[model samples]
Each structure stands twice: as structure tokens, then as C-alpha cells.
Target: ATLKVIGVGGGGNNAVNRMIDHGMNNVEFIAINTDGQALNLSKAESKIQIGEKLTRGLGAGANPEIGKKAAEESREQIEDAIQGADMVFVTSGMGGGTGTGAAPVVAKIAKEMGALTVGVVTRPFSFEGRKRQTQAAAGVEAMKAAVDTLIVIPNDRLLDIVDKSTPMMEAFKEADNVLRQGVQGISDLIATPGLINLDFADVKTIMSNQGSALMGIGVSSGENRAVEAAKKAISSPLLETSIVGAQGVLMNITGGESLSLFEAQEAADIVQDAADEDVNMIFGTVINPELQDEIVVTVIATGF
Candidate 1:
């Protein structure tokens, strides 16, 4: 079956553009920001301004009252987007009113609609204040109860990837670049051509297994084993492989450079060897800008 993907939340526009940039053509992107201006920032297929106020406060000390209200307003908007979605990727920059509050509500609705939902959220930096971090953590917990998977990207981690000496704005831009690369890595993996070309169903299965996952993005100056580096990246305490009974697999890869057919075949074979799934699907694509011989893989185990 063709995958019907829905990208929902305040970051929906960026998410949509990213997906399209990676060649995910059959996707529906919707912006559910309370601030009408945030919606105009991206060219999503649909944009919604759920009548709600932004959360007041910065972090853990933030207002749950505002959060609840935002969630309530976004409920209907979410349900409308998830109707026939085979898999939903809910992307948001959390720790604020719209993204933090409404994301979980939307995930819950997606679950109720029987679509496997995965949340990809960007957390606030430690420097942002304890309130924001606390609020983000609280939001994470809330989302855990609703979505099958959650992938968290902490802003603090960006410090390691970027020049700390740089100004805050510049640092943030670098951090955003790192994030974009990480997301693009996964998108590249699923979209690239190879022996075991994977697809959205495969992604859904992998995400469903983890229930929650995290991706770390960094750059290497010298040549490195992409697969080994990726494995190392997954070693973080946060990358818990906790999804129960996960067994199916699907994947695809996309990149600007055409991989050596032999190398591409080898890559697919390696993934299959690693996954050892009862059922699997895989595919790849050659895109415009060359990817840094990076390795990206997604695995889903089904028993949970």
C-alpha cells in the first residue's frame, strides 16, 4: 500500500519542506500553530490556527493550564489530518505553547485513528532556563502516553557539534543545520537506491518498535565508517530500543550522488543481515546534492 504521511504541528512547514527535499513526494504537511504568523513561514499543504493561547512561562515551571488549553484546541485539527494516514510523523519545536501543548493531543488522536504515530521534537537548550527544560520533559512524558514513538533532539547536545565560542544566534543556526542533517540522513537512507529498497511502512515499523527514539547529528572532518559512526550515535542512553514485539522492516534511501551500484547493493545487503526480519521492504534513490557517505537505518520489531 502507498504510504499516506501527515506532518503536523508548528514545525509542520519545515518538516514538509525537508521531506520534499529528500524526495518524499506523497506527504501532506499541515501547520497547526496558534500564532498565525508561524504558519506563514512555511509552504505546507494545509495551515490551521487553532484558537488557543501560547503557554506562559519558560521551562519546568511553565503553565500546565495553558498547555491543556492548547492541546484541547488542537485536537480536532489533528484528527482531521490523520484520517487515512498509514503513518504520521509529528514534528514540533517544543517547550512553548503550540508545539509543546498540542503535540501529544494530536498523537493521541492519531493513535485513536489506528495510524502508527511517531513524534520528532526539538528540545530547548539548557541555557534557555530550567523552566523550558522542565516543560519539555513534561511534554515528553505526556507524548509518551499517546504516540508509539518519540525521537528527541536536545539543544544542549548541539554545543558539541557547533562552535561554542560563536554568538548564540550563530550557534543556534549551526545547531539547526545539524538537526537538518540528521533528519536528512534518515530521509536519505529511506530514499536512496539499493538492493533492499525500503519505504514508509518500514519506517513506521521501526518507529513503532522503539516507541521512542533519538537521533544525534554531527560532522566528521576525516573519512569514517558511516555505519560504525551511526551505531555509535545510537548508543546514547536515550536511544532505548524498548518497543516490544517489533519484527517487520521497510527502508529507502535518497541522495544527490549516484552510489556505485555495487556499493549500494552492499549497503542493502548489510542492512538485511542486521535486521533479520520476518518481512522486509527496501529501495533507494539518487538525488542532486551528494550525501557525505553517511549511513542511516531504521528497524522495527513488532511484538509490543
Candidate 2:
């Protein structure tokens, strides 16, 4: 399957940069922005500057209408960039101009082009004020209809997990990490061959038009590692709601050669135990030689 990771606007562009700096393989990254200077900073495989005349290389100044127009102005380019992806993950921040407006446009194009589109975005921190929060709420709503599944992380949640004194840069970095993992997780699920392989069709069955969803990643080593990782994933800081009401789950477990069948099954069982008894659960496992004593689990709970 051809996988594409698209970052829209300033915040989204930074997310793609973070993923590249952290090292991802076998996927193409594209950065889109109305601001030429911001677009130049991206490390993606391709960079697109939308609304050359509308914005004149300047940013939208937090005005979503302008952002929308900018995206519309370059509709052909956006469509061309997203043309051949089998699965597309659109990442952005929801409170600002370009991201709040242009992200949905990108997702809509990807969906229209017959790709399984997933949107991962972040809401504003409380300090950003009520207006921005309201705008972000609207952005999320618009984005929900444009993609097969949408995962949203509230920036205020960072406060609950990190120290109050944590640097602002690190706080934002943490948010980017969640998006990066979510994209990489789905990409690996389809790209990597495992003992029990999960094809793109299986992922499509669980994620297609699923609406709101939650993504969590956990890694652990030593005693009862698989169970511990599963628990941590279920309790991820980004999850605002319980998994009890979720209708479907897709999990990928990666471990070393030492990983036993019992351990893998135990991890999946733990996730299933947290959701409804009839939840549509699908999981896959991969053995990575580098992870000698550790196990990593990535889970996406959908139908929220």
C-alpha cells in the first residue's frame, strides 16, 4: 500500500518535521502551507505553497476564511499531491487559520480520491482563549465528516501529564509525538509482514467512516511487559473518554524474537477486556530483531 503523511499549516508542518527528525521509513511526507517561509522549513519529500496570490506568501493571520480560500485557490495542486495514496494521514493543529481551514479540504480531496483518510489534530491550550477554542471545535467538526476516522488531542491535556514547569517547546513536542506514532502505527500495520498478517482491507473494515477515534502507544520491558504495555496504552494521556463505548479496535504489537504467543494474546485480551464484549477487534503482530527485551503496542479505538 502507498502511504502518505501530509502536514498542513504551521503546526502541521512542524509535526511532519518532528517525525522526520525522529526517523520514519517507507513513507512519503508532504508539507502544505500558505506561508512561503514556513513551507521552506519543512523536511518533507515535497512542499506545497497554496494561494500564491491570495496570501501573497504571507500567512492567513488566524483567519480560517482566508485559509479556506487559499486552499481553494490551489485545489489542483493539493489534489495532485494527494493523488495516488492508498492511505493518507492528515495532521494539523485545529485553532489557527491554515490548519483549521485547509486540513479538511485536504482530507476531503484524499477521501474523494479513494484513499482511506485519517485526520489527527490537536485542540488549543486553555490559555489560547475562548475564541480560538470555539474555532478549533468547529474545525474538528468539519474535519470529522471529511475523513474516515479522526483522532483529536486537546492541548490542555498536556498539563495533566507533564510537569507545570515543563518548557513550552517540550510540551508541543509531546503533542507532535502522539500524531507521529499514530501515523507510523497504521503505516507499519499494513507495510510490515508478520506471522499473522493484517492486510489493508482489514484496517479499512475497522477504520472506514468510523468518525471520532483514540490512539495510544505504550512500550515496556521486563516482568509482565506485554500486559503492562497494554494497560498503559489504554490509559494514554490523550484519551479523553473511556474505551467502554468504542465499537471497534485495531491494535499492532511489535516485539523481539523472544515474544511468545501467550504474551501477544495476553496483550490483545487486555485491550478487549476494556471495551464492550461485542467490540470489533482486529490486531497484528510484528517481530523486530532490534527489540530484544521490549514490546511496543499501538492501539486505535474507534466508533467513539
Candidate 3:
């Protein structure tokens, strides 16, 4: 399936830049902002500047209404950018203008065009004050209404991922990398070549039935490869909220020719064992000839 990733506003643009920096294929990256200067800084395949007249290269000043109007003014360009995609992935930080308002517009368009739309939004940090938090809550509701599935990550969760003493820039860098991994886990599950492939139709069926989902990824090698990878993936920092309630899982186990059937079964079985007995799982294996001792396991479970 063809996938397109769009980073709306400043925060989303950072994560998307990190995503491309780490290297990804079978997916296109786009950065959309009302600020032309910010658009210039993005490293995506395409850059879109909306509401040229309203912002005049400045940002939306955190106004959702202005953000919506900017997006409206450039609706044609945004539509043209996302043309011909089976799935559209949108990521942004709520509480801001472009992200809080324009994100739903983008998702609503893709949803209208019959594409699977998934939105991952970030809530304001506890220190960002109640007004921003309230705005983020409203933004989440709007985006949820516009998309098929919405995955929300609270900024406070970053505290668990990185130390408090970390430099602000370093913290943001870490956040971007981790966020990229989270999104990549799901993308690889769908786009990466794998044995026992799970096609787009199967994913669609699973996601539609599940309102929200969680993604996890792990890497291991040398010994007890699959076991180590699967363990870390389930216990990933991003998935701090336990996977006990998950009802469906899509797992992609990627390794070299040395991969064993036992390894494959062990990796997948761990997921089922951790979930309810009735949980359904779809499995796939991706062979990477270059990977000798390195094995990577990626999983995305839904019904959370």
C-alpha cells in the first residue's frame, strides 16, 4: 500500500524530519506550515506553505481559526500533495495553530477520499498551562472525528523516556527519534516486504474495528534474538500503558536467512500470551539478507 506522512506545524515537522533522517522508503514525507521560513527548514520530499497572505511567512500565533483558514486557502495544494495514497499518516503537536486546527482538515479530506487516515497527536507538557492543555483536548476531539483512528501521546510521557536534566534540544531530539520509531513500526508492518505478508485489506479490517492502537518495536541479536526483541517491544517505554486490553496484533519479524521457525513462533506467541485469549493476531516475516546476527521485531496492536 502507498503511504504518505505529513507533518503539520512545527512540532510534527520535527518528528517527520527525524523520520526521514533515519531513512524510510515506500513512504513519502511532506511538511505543511503557514510559516514559509519553517517550511524552508523542513527536509521532507515536499514543502507546502498555506495562507501566504495571512501569515506572510510568520506563524499562526497559535490561533486555530487562522490555522483553519490558512489550510482552507490552500486546500487544492494540500490535496494535490496527498493524491493517490492508500494510507495517510498525520502527526502534529496540539495546542498550536496549524496542528490543532489544520490537522483535522487534512485527516477529514483523506477520510473523505476513502483512504485510511491515522493521526498521532501530542498533548502539551504539564508546564504548558491549562489553556494549551484545554486546546489540545479540543484538538484531539476534532481530529478524532475527522480520522479513522487517532493515537494520542501526552508530552509528560517524555519524562519517562528521557532524563529531566537533559538539555531542551537534546530532549527534543530524543523525542523525535522515538516518535519516528513508533510511526515506522506501523509503516513497516504494512509496507515492508515480508513473508506471510499481511496485506492492506487485512490491516484495514483490523484498524476499522479498533478505534485506537499502540505500536511497539524492538531490536536484538547475538543470542535469544527473537525473545529479547519481542520482550523489549512489548515493554517499550512508549507503550507504558500496558497492552493487556489489546484485542488484535500485527507483527512483522525481520531477520536474515538464519531466522528459525522457533524464533518466529516465539516472537508472535509472546504477543498473544500477553493479550486476552480471544485476541486475533496477524504475522509476517521480512527477510533481510544483509542482516546476519541482527534481528528486528516490530509490532502494532489495536483494540486498546
Candidate 4:
């Protein structure tokens, strides 16, 4: 099944492009930007402009007027792109009008088209001001309601890897690289060939349990080790002991000179061991040309 990858309007075009660069041959890219410049940055297979003027303002919460207009114009374009796609992954940088206001509409449209939708959103750093943070939080809620699952990457988390004294553009580049690694890691995992550990249906179930499940990815060097790294990344006490209603697990391994189909299986074994009986299903993948042996895993647990 072909995976339709859509890059929605956001400040994280660099990150989205990086994902595309590393994606498997079966993946497709689309850029839905508010302007030509942003669309150009995505280099999407299909591009659509929301026709809204860019705002220099840091945080523009949910602008009903702008959102309504964007939905009217771009919704059909997005809907058509996602049709018959096995999985639809949407990427955006939150806390702004174009990404925050428009992404949910896209997700809703994807769902209406019967595609399994997932959203990858990057949030603003603490220093980006309370307004951006507030808007990002709202965007998260809206996206959760619209998409099957949402993976949130925080800007503050990225700051830890970036040089504090670096200029904004350089800092952004560093952060974008980190996010790209994570996104590519997951993309590689699902696209790889392995046992029928899990598939789109499993991901959909995980997304349905939005309240209790949290999806995360971790990248490392090596073939099968990436899956282990992903499992370890998600094995948090905050998440471990929680008695969620249902747990849906998706594990992907991308990168390395050769992919070990057996290693991919082992990755699922590790996550199952860590999760014990709590996990409902485990999905595994193995890909090639990885930056390093990296593992990106996403888990969705139900029951708060």
C-alpha cells in the first residue's frame, strides 16, 4: 500500500523535507502551504496554497475566519490526495495560523475519506512566549480530535540539543534535524518488510485510544537495535504502570546497510516484554540507508 505523506503549512518545512529525503520509494509528498515560499520549501509532490497572507505575529491562536476560508479552498485538494492511501501522515509546526488553524481541517477531511490519519506536530519552546504555548496546546487538542493519532515534538525539547547562543536560523536547523531523524526513523520502520506484526488497522486502534496512549520514536545506529532504542524510549514509568483500556503499538526500524527482518521481529519482542500483557498489538518494520541504526516507536494506550 502506498503511504501518502502530506506536509502542511508550518514553520517546520525543513524537518518535513528531511523526512521526504529519507522516505521509502512507496511514499508520496505533498505541501499545503499558505504561500509559495513555504510550498517551495516542501518540494511536495502536490502543492496547494491556502491563499492567506503570512503573519509575522508569533502566535495567532485559531482564527476562525482564516480557518474557515482555508477549509473551503484546500479541503478538497487534501481529501483527494489522501484517497485510497493506506496511511496518511501529516506534518506541521504548531503555534501559528497556517499550521494550527489548517491542519485539523485536513485531518478531518482525511478521516472522512477513510484514511488512517496521523499528525506530527512541533510545539513552540517555552521562550517562544505563553501565547504560542497556549495556541499550541489548543492545536494539540483540535488535532487529537480530528486525527487518529498525533506525535508531539516540543521546541523546548529540541533546545536541549541546540546551542543556546546560536542564531535563530541555525538553532532552527539543529532542531529540524533532530525532528527529521525521529520522523524518518518511524517512516523507515513501517515501510520495511517483516512479519505481519501490525498494520494500519493496529495504528487506527491506537489512535482511537488517544487519552492513554503516547507515541514516541528513538533512533540509534545498527539494524535491529533501532527497534530496541524505540522500545526503551517509550518505556517510561509515567506510561508503564498505567492501566490503559487498550494498547496499540507501532514499531519501525529504518537505516543501516542491511535490514534484518529477524531483527525487526526482535524489536517487537522487546516492546512486548517491556509492555508485558498491556500491549494489544505490535507492528514492526526494517528499512535501509539509515543515518544510523535508529528506532522510532509509537504507542497508544487507552483508559487514561
What's each prediction's clash count? 49, 0, 0, 12
Alpha-carbon error at 102 in model 3, in Å? 0.7
TM-score of each: 0.63, 0.93, 0.89, 0.70
Q: What tens digits encode model 2's per-residue C-alpha lDDT throughout 1-304?
A: 8889999999899889988998988788999999899887889989899977878898888988878788877889988998888999999989999999999999998999999999988899899999999999999998998999898888888898678688988877787777777777777777788877777888888889999787778899999999999887778576455566787988888999999999998998888888856667887888898888999988888876
Q: On residues 234-291, what C-alpha lDDT tens digit does candidate 3 reach at each position?
A: 7745433466778877777889999999899988878888775567877788887989
User: Which candidate wins on TM-score?
Assistant: 2
**lDDT by residue for model 4 over 1-304, one digit each (tens)?**
5567776665645556766665545577777766556566566677766645433322223453364357557677767767787667777777777677777788778877877777777777788799888887888788888887666667776555556577866655654543354344445445555444445455555555263245545555554464666565564332222323335555554445555666656666666666556666645443445445444444443333
Better of 2 and 3 by lDDT: 2
Show the colliding residue pairs in model 2: none
* Cand. 2 Cα-lDDT: 0.86
lDDT by residue (169-191, candidate 1, tens digit) is 56545434333444455554545
Worst 10 residues of 3 by lDDT: 234-243
Best first by lDDT, ranked? 2, 3, 4, 1
The runs of at least 3 residues in candidate 4 whose Cα sits more than 4 Å from the true structure, single-residue gaps closed, are 22-24, 52-65, 163-197, 208-246, 251-277, 283-304
> Given candidate 2, what's the lDDT at residue 65?
80
Give the range of the ten consecutive residues with the poorest summed lDDT in model 4: 236-245
Q: Pick the candidate with the highest lDDT.
A: 2
